[PDB]
Amino acid sequence: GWDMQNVITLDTSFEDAKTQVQLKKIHSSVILLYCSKDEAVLILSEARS
Amino acid sequence: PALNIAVLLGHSHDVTERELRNLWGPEQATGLPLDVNVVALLMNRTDPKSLITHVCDLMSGARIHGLVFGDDTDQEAVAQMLDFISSQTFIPILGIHGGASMIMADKDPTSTFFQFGASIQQQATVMLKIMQDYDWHVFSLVTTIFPGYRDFISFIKTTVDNSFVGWDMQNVITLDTSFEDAKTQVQLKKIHSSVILLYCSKDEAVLILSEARSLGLTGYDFFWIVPSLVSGNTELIPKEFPSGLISVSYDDWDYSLEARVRDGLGILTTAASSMLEKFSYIPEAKASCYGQAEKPETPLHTLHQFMVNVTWDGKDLSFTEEGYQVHPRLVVIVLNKDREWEKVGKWENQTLSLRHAVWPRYKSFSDCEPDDNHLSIVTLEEAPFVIVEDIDPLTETCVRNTVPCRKFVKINNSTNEGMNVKKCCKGFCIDILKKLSRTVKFTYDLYLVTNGKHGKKVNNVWNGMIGEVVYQRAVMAVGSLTINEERSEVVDFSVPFVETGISVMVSR
Amino acid sequence: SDKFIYATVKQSSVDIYFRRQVELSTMYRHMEKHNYESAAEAIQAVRD
Amino acid sequence: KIVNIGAVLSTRKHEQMFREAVNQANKRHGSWKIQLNATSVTHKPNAIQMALSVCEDLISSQVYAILVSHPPTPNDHFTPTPVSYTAGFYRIPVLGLTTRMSIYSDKSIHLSFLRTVPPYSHQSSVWFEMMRVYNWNHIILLVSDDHEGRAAQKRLETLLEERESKAEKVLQFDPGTKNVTALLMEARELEARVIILSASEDDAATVYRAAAMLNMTGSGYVWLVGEREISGNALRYAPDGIIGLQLINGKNESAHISDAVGVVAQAVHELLEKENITDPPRGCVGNTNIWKTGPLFKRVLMSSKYADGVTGRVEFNEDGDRKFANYSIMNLQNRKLVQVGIYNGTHVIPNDRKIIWPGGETEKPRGYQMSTRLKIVTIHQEPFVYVKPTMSDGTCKEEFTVNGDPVKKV
Amino acid sequence: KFGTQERVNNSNKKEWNGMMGELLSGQADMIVAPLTINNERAQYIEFS
Ligand SMILES: *[C@@H]1O[C@H](CO)[C@@H](O[C@@H]2O[C@H](CO)[C@@H](O)[C@H](O)[C@H]2NC(C)=O)[C@H](O)[C@H]1NC(C)=O
Ligand SMILES: *[C@@H]1O[C@H](CO)[C@@H](O[C@@H]2O[C@H](CO)[C@@H](O)[C@H](O)[C@H]2NC(C)=O)[C@H](O)[C@H]1NC(C)=O
Ligand SMILES: *[C@@H]1O[C@H](CO)[C@@H](O[C@@H]2O[C@H](CO)[C@@H](O)[C@H](O)[C@H]2NC(C)=O)[C@H](O)[C@H]1NC(C)=O
Ligand SMILES: *[C@@H]1O[C@H](CO)[C@@H](O)[C@H](O)[C@H]1NC(C)=O
Ligand SMILES: *[C@@H]1O[C@H](CO)[C@@H](O)[C@H](O)[C@H]1NC(C)=O
Ligand SMILES: *[C@@H]1O[C@H](CO)[C@@H](O)[C@H](O)[C@H]1NC(C)=O
Ligand SMILES: *[C@@H]1O[C@H](CO)[C@@H](O)[C@H](O)[C@H]1NC(C)=O
Ligand SMILES: *[C@@H]1O[C@H](CO)[C@@H](O)[C@H](O)[C@H]1NC(C)=O
Ligand SMILES: *[C@@H]1O[C@H](CO)[C@@H](O)[C@H](O)[C@H]1NC(C)=O
Ligand SMILES: *[C@@H]1O[C@H](CO)[C@@H](O)[C@H](O)[C@H]1NC(C)=O
Ligand SMILES: *[C@@H]1O[C@H](CO)[C@@H](O)[C@H](O)[C@H]1NC(C)=O
Ligand SMILES: *[C@@H]1O[C@H](CO)[C@@H](O)[C@H](O)[C@H]1NC(C)=O
Ligand SMILES: *[C@@H]1O[C@H](CO)[C@@H](O)[C@H](O)[C@H]1NC(C)=O
């Protein structure tokens, strides 16, 4: 009974108008991330913000 | 008795002194016990020394018992100065246009200076009325340390706490400083899809809206409602203002300057007449501004308590204790797709009349994502499935388990046009539609069909809900719509969610 | 209907309960026009 | 190169010492780059005359800031209002030396106005600290209905909202009311015994006199007041044991002149290191446009921290008022004010003096006194609350149940 | 009246009437009566 809410792909930059309305769509308590370490740093900083 | 009223204006307007004098020539017994000797004057520019000298010369020479000041520039300081002058001369001054019309917060208790404007409280009331009329109950509140922000926030909180409407005020954000540096992005990033009441200055609203666009806060579903403070001069419009930026302001389109001067003269004349009926006579003006007269100088009778009960020819131009108009001429304007402030609604005798019954979607910018999750849905009233009722008398908004729906009701059979009245629709099909909106994640603009009745092909033309759907006037037809061979040929039906054949009912 | 008339005490807990309920709203609109000032008066009206 | 600074001052010797302070600041900073000229004007009895004089003398001299202070005459009915308006037309910053009214904190009215003394509303902050020190949670406000009382009330409630607590009652009376016994009688029936007053000297005297007759100044009551309520006529009728505040240098003209001149000189020097700086307007008549860098100059002034001031560390908050001022808490013991502690910038620190609370007792009175006479409300419900008319003697007939026990009636 | 939050005709202000208003306005310190416990009343006063 998995509940896979949404698939988010951050094709653009991690600070523009996109990847903000996309990242705000996360209402679940578990986030499965996939990226490089360098992109992970930026994505996690944005998520913390 | 003779009442001398002075009218000070600027060269920016084309009105002449002869026209100002002729404005008080209606000759239908405007003043029953008194006549008004209007004296006009035009000033090149407004500044402390020359303004004071002009007013003092008017009081000394013309012995004016009042004043009607109309400024051309946008100097908010002038109003304050006028108030000061009034407190030093007891001359009832009226702020008509320009800087003198910008509502000042706390006037001197001993000063008789009234303004033709709307305070921040009235603008906030109109904004909340817009939000209630368009069912934007959930909203945020972004303010800055601009003066008067505390009063705006306090009034918004008080009105929210003392209303039967939902008013889910999500959060209050106060950008102290460094909008782009830090400590402000964190606050602005927690604002979700909602209405954002913004209170700041125009040169600062530009920065705030630029940052909001950079944070993706200016989509189709974000409605920025702002007071007249940031809209300011309608002629100049920054490129950072999103289209659909709802604002409220004192109307400078319909309320002409001549009408303003006529209304001010009428207010002063009616107050003087009421004083004549109640008190003995018109108090003579002060001797002079200068000289340092040794006296308390407080007049035995003044017009302060007689401007609260004023009724001109047709309008009720009464003032409040603080000096605000009880019935201001407020207008709700939006920034349409042409990047020009287009008047939408008006605020008359404590009622907000809006042109657009349903809010039109405005493309905020050229690169905005297209509107695809918003659908237009037709519906026809059927007794068990779609029940259409009026708005709740208590909360003045659509009740629980019910959704807004605009019915195009004609004024009468005489006219060939009508108005869209926002009624409340419920029932089986409406519950199905609500569940579909929740599951498929789409928003809808429900509206009753007025062309036909359930659909029929007359002259190879479909009417009713089927006609609306086939002619692309709607995305879907939620209602008591029966699946048919011809209808399925014309439109695409979903799965039948209730079995409805044809059956015969007889009296037992 | 207009034949079976029923109500309760105006400005009381049951009035709030019927106002809050979502299904019974219709019959709430039936009671708002007949609500009595006090329970004793309503009981007397039921009695006669 | 020469930079003008204007000062509307009470007396000629004050203008002379202002010139001396300007010369000292010029020597300290260095007059090689910019020389600070100093023009001064004595106050005028007529407000219109003063608003004309600031245009003819200060504005026509192309000043950068105006330092305004109260006149020597004890009347203080918003004296800097002309200047703060006229120099507010061009957004020229105005420094208030000894004007503690709370109207000037409204930046929507006085567009360009700073001051080195906090307004009378910030005294409420001190009161809050006392509530944190002596653990008083139930209070009664007696603010006046004018702008000052409303501002003090708003500031105190804003402070209390952080504590998630509210004042028991906020009684408002119109300024200059001869009879105020109604509000005091309303206050007496409450539970809170911490009475906080914010009113002018005459209104404070009236409240003190009307509370003396009601025996509300006795033991168990504690009065917290400001500086106006323990100065002048209000001190003549002040109840003993009242606790009031006194600004350390609120009435000192020379220290405020010196520190204001120092901070404005530092701000001028800092401003003239920026680009596209615009000269101030010259003369009111014929110049209807605001000073372009006026708002920038005010923003510089509000963000400047004077290091060594005669009155202390000069710092302006967002409202342009003085921040972190020293309040000398005073208690009226034996018809004489004695300092029972001092409120520094953030905290109250007491001293060796013993506080004599109203009534003469030395132990700290409790915040309130719990009432054991509850006002009960009931509604006529037949099974629960039977209600019957009384007989002619004031009671109603005693009955008995089936068991013979008497029914208890009230 | 037992008590119900009603809109006063001026300024559209919520106000409690009856026992609820009497208790919240300080005129009474306790309500010993058949006062039903519900969510609407419990937000402003507290029941035993
Ligand atoms: C500041 O410079 C101005 C000249 O730019 C001086 O203003 C005049 O000074 C004389 C002598 O003090 C006065 O008699 C005049 O009345 C002033 N002119 C005006 C405005 O009427 C001013 O004195 C200089 N400040 C000082 C005292 O050094
Ligand atoms: C001040 O006002 C109060 C309240 O009105 C007065 O107190 C009572 O007022 C009623 C009338 O409302 C009188 O009938 C009573 O005799 C008053 N009782 C007293 C003496 O407290 C109070 O008298 C007024 N005081 C003055 C001097 O004006
Ligand atoms: C004076 O104001 C200061 C803040 O400016 C108060 O804060 C104290 O500052 C001293 C500086 O050495 C610290 O050691 C204390 O720890 C601070 N207060 C406490 C108790 O935390 C100070 O309380 C005020 N009065 C004093 C005692 O100077
Ligand atoms: C307005 O400008 C005109 C033309 O310069 C001048 O003659 C007139 O004196 C000015 N107004 C006044 C009365 O100051
Ligand atoms: C004053 O206000 C009253 C309110 O009823 C109104 O009836 C009356 O006409 C007003 N006074 C005038 C305009 O005579
Ligand atoms: C404005 O609307 C109110 C409410 O219907 C009404 O009482 C009032 O008379 C109206 N005023 C006018 C003259 O439009
Ligand atoms: C008036 O009503 C009739 C139907 O009785 C309709 O046919 C006619 O079009 C109406 N008038 C208009 C809208 O012109
Ligand atoms: C107009 O409205 C009136 C309201 O009574 C109605 O009786 C009439 O039939 C309508 N038609 C006309 C004459 O426009
Ligand atoms: C104190 O004052 C009150 C005012 O009503 C009075 O009733 C009481 O008797 C007085 N008590 C003393 C100390 O006599
Ligand atoms: C004012 O302050 C100065 C400097 O601290 C001091 O020399 C002077 O005595 C003070 N005057 C009064 C009366 O406070
Ligand atoms: C100062 O003004 C000049 C124009 O004279 C402008 O080019 C420059 O950018 C300004 N300095 C600032 C605000 O960066
Ligand atoms: C306040 O009081 C202290 C006592 O030592 C004094 O030294 C200091 O200058 C004052 N500071 C402020 C905040 O004015
Ligand atoms: C309006 O409210 C006041 C105060 O509750 C009340 O006295 C008055 O009767 C009300 N008027 C009507 C009929 O709504």
All partners of chain C with 3 or more CB pairs under 8 angstroms: B, D, E
- What is the Cα–Cα distance from B286 to B87, expressed in whole angstroms? 12
DSSP B126-173: HHHHHHHHTT---EEEEEESSTTHHHHHHHHHHHHHT-SS---EEEEE
* Cα–Cα distance measured from residue D295 to residue B158, given in angstroms and rounded to the nearest whole number: 33
The resolution in angstroms reads 3.1
Nearest CB to E28; choose among D371, D377, D381: D377
* Euclidean distance between CA atoms D54 and B49, whole angstroms: 9
Residue type, B271: A
- Which pair of tokens denotes residue B261? 């001067």
Q: What does the alpha-carbon distance between residue D385 and residue B119 come to, in Å, rounded to a whole number?
A: 51
Q: What residues contact B21, with CB distance under 8 A and at least 6 apart?
A: B38, B39, B40
Q: Does the beta carbon of B351 lie inside 6 Å of ligand 6?
A: yes
Closest CA to D111 of D138, D143, D88: D88
> End-to-end CA distance of chain C, in Å?
20
What span, in angstroms and rounded, lies between the C-alpha atoms of B400 and B124?
A: 26
Give all strands (DSSP E) within B449-490, no chain letters. 456-458, 461-463, 476-477
How many angstroms separate the CA atoms of D289 and D292, rounded? 8
Angle at B229 between CA B228 and CA B234, to 5 degrees: 60
Residues tagged in the binding site annotation of B: 13, 97, 235, 251, 480, 482, 487
Integer Cα distance of A16 and A21 in angstroms: 10
Residues D300, D244 contacting (CB under 8 angstroms): no
Cβ burial of C19 (10 Å; 0-12, 13-18, 19+) is: middle
State CA B365 to chain mean position distance: 24
Chains C and A touch (3+ CB pairs under 8 A): no
B454 CA to centre of own chain: 39
Measure in Å the smallest separation between the Cα of D380 and chain E Cα atoms. Answer: 8
Q: Starting at the earlier edge strand, list the strands of the sheet with D327-332.
A: D169-170, D139-143, D194-198, D222-224, D243-244, D327-332, D337-343, D348-349
Q: Which of E1, E24, E30 to mutate to test the interface with D (most CBs of D within 10 A)?
A: E30
Contact present, D358 and D144 (Cβ < 8 Å)? no
d(CA D204, CA D223): 12
Give the Cα separation of B122 and B348 in Å (integer): 12
Binding residues of E for glycine: 34, 36, 41
Beta bridge partners of D308: none
Ligand 12 centroid to residue D236 C-alpha, Å: 30
Would the CB of D276 count as within 6 Å of ligand 11? yes
For B:204-223, CB contacts with A below 8 A are 213-216, 219
Q: Tokens in use for E28? A: 């009474």
User: CA–CA separation, B329 vs B260, rounded Å?
Assistant: 11
Residues in E touching C20 (Cβ below 8 Å): 40
Chain D positions in Cβ-Cβ contact with residue B80 (cut-off 8 Å): 85, 88, 109-111
Q: Which of D331, D342, D139 is nearest to D239 (CA)?
A: D331
Alpha-carbon span B392 to D324, nearest angstrom:
54
Chain A residues with beta carbon closer than 8 angstroms to that of B192: 24
Query: Look-up: residue for tokens 């519950």?
Result: B431
Chosen from D89, D285, D299 to mutate, greatest number of chain B CBs within 10 A: D89
- Residue B394: closest C-alpha in chain C: C19
DSSP state letter for D385: B
* Alpha-helical runs (H) found in chain E: 18-24, 39-42
Torsion sign across C-alpha atoms A7, A11, A13, A16: negative
**Quick one: residue B401, left, alpha or beta (phi over 0 = left, psi -120 to 50 = alpha)?**
left
Within 8 A by CB and 6+ apart from D391, the residues are D397
By three-state DSSP, how is residue B240 classified?
coil
Using the mean position of ligand 7's atoms as its centre, give its distance from the Cα of residue B412 in Å. 10
Identify which of D175, D108, D124 has the alpha carbon closest to the alpha carbon of residue B106.
Answer: D108
B167: left (phi over 0), alpha (psi -120 to 50) or beta: left
Rounded to a whole number, what is the distance in Å from the CA of C42 to chain B's nearest CA?
A: 25
C-alpha dihedral (D386, D391, D396, D400), degrees to nearest 10: -90
Residues 6 or more apart whose CB falls under 8 angstroms from that of D115 comprise D95, D96, D97, D99, D100, D104, D320, D321, D322
- Look at residues B149, B156, B96 and name the one whose alpha carbon lies nearest to residue B122: B156
What are B420's strand-pairing partners?
A: B408
Name the residue of D271, D276, D279, D293 to mutate for ligand 11: max ligand atoms within 8 A of Cβ.
D276
Rounded Cα–Cα distance for residues D193 and D370 (Å): 10
Spatial distance between the Cα atoms of B356 and B342, rounded to a whole number of angstroms = 12
Residues 6+ away with beta carbon under 8 Å from B182: none
> Are residues C12 and E6, on separate chains, in Cβ contact within 8 Å?
no
Strand partners for E14: E7
Per the DSSP assignment, residues forming a β-bridge with E16 are: E5
B413 lines ligand 7 (CB under 6 A): yes
DSSP state of D112: S
With the CA atoms of D358, D361, D363 and D368 taken in that order, what torsion angle do they form, in degrees rounded to the nearest 10? -40
Kindly tell me the number of DSSP H helices and DSSP E strands found in chain C: 3, 0
Distances (CA, A) of B329 to B240, B253, B347, B349: 28, 11, 6, 9
Rounded to 5 degrees, what angle do the CA atoms B230, B232, B234 make? 120
| Atom 9 of ligand 7, nearest CA residue | B413
**D330/D321 Cα distance (integer angstroms):** 23
Interface partners of chain B (CB pairs < 8 Å, 3 or more) are: A, C, D, E
| Torsional class of B93: left (φ above 0), alpha (ψ -120 to 50), beta (otherwise) | beta
Q: DSSP for B313-356? A: SSS---B-TTS-BSS--EEEEEE-TTSSEEEEEEEETTEEEES-
Neighbouring chains to D with at least 3 Cβ pairs closer than 8 Å: B, C, E
CB-based contact, D89 to chain B, within 8 Å: yes
> Is residue B428 within 8 Å of residue B384, measured between CB atoms?
yes
Task: Indicate the residue type of D272.
Answer: L
C3 C-beta neighbours (distance < 10 Å), count? 4
- Supply angle C-alpha D245, D151, B86, rounded to 5: 115
Euclidean distance between CA atoms B140 and B167, whole angstroms: 10
* Residues in contact with A42: Cβ distance below 8 Å, sequence separation at least 6, in sequence order: A14
Helix (H, G, I), strand (E, B) or coil at D122: coil
- Give residue D140 CA to ligand 3 midpoint distance, Å: 29
d(CA B505, CA B507): 7
The interaxial angle of helices D81-89 and B77-89, nearest 10 deg, is 150
d(C-alpha B51, C-alpha B49), whole Å = 6
Q: Closest ligand 3 atom to the C-alpha of D346?
A: 2
> Which numbered ligand comes closest to the C-alpha of B273?
5
For A23, left (φ over 0), alpha (ψ -120 to 50), or beta? alpha
| Contact of B90 with B302, CB cutoff 8 Å | yes
SS3 D339: strand
3-state DSSP call for residue D340?
strand
Separation CA B261–CA B257 (nearest Å): 6
Give the alpha-carbon dihedral of D184, D189, D190, D195, to 10 degrees.
30
Q: How far is CA C39 from CA B24, C9, D215, in A?
A: 64, 6, 46
For ligand 8, say whether the CB of B413 is within 6 Å of any of its atoms. Answer: yes
Reading the block at residue D41, the tokens are 């004007």
- The rounded distance, in Å, linking the Cα atoms of B259 and B314 is 13
Q: D338 has which bridge partners?
A: D331
Q: Which amino acid is at D243?
A: I
Write down the residue that tokens 């209050």 correspond to: B172
d(CA B365, CA B397): 31
Which residues are registered as beta bridge partners of D349? Answer: D342
| Angstrom distances, CA of residue B289 to CA of B463, B487, D22, D73 | 77, 85, 34, 21
Q: How far apart are CA D263 and CA D96, in angstroms?
A: 13
H or E segment and range at residue D196 = strand D194-198
Cα gap B497→D174, rounded to integer Å: 69
Measured in whole angstroms, the distance separating CA B25 from the mean position of its chain's CA atoms is 33
Q: Closest by alpha carbon to D262, among D8, D2, D9, D27? A: D27
Which residues, in sequence order, are CB contacts of D278 under 8 Å at separation 6+? D291, D292, D293
Measured CA to CA in angstroms, residue D24 lies from D18, D20, D27 at distances of: 10, 6, 5
End-to-end CA distance of chain D: give it in Å, rounded: 89
**B163 part of contact set with chain E, CB < 8 Å:** yes
DSSP state of B307: S
- Closest residue on chain C to E35 (Cα): C13
Measure Cα distances from B154 to B148, D130, D159 in Å: 10, 27, 14
Q: Residue D368: how many CB atoms within 10 A of its CB? A: 18
SS3 label, residue B98: helix
| B244-247 long-range Cβ contacts below 8 angstroms, 24+ apart | B244/B334, B244/B335, B244/B336, B244/B361, B244/B362, B244/B363, B244/B364, B245/B209, B245/B334, B245/B335, B246/B127, B246/B130, B246/B332, B246/B333, B246/B334, B246/B344, B247/B332, B247/B333, B247/B334, B247/B335, B247/B341
| For D371, nearest residue in chain E (alpha carbons) | E29
* Residue D343 DSSP class: E
D349: helix, coil or strand? strand
Of D102, D123, D125, D124, nearest to D113 by C-alpha is D102
Q: Method of determination?
A: cryo-EM
CB contact under 8 A, D86 and B48: yes
Chain position carrying tokens 């006296």: B295
Contact across the interface for A21 and B186, Cβ inside 8 Å: no
Name the pairing type of β-strands D3-9 and B387-389: unpaired
Report the alpha-carbon distance of residue C42 to residue B30 in Å, rounded: 58
* D293: phi then psi, degrees, rounded to nearest 5: -95, 10
Calculate the alpha carbon distances from B70 to A7, B106, D88 in Å.
61, 20, 20
Long-range contacts of residues E17-20, Cβ cutoff 8 Å, at least 24 apart: E17/C11, E18/C11, E18/D379, E19/D377, E19/D379, E20/E44, E20/E45
Asked if B213 and A20 come within 8 Å (Cβ–Cβ), the reply is no
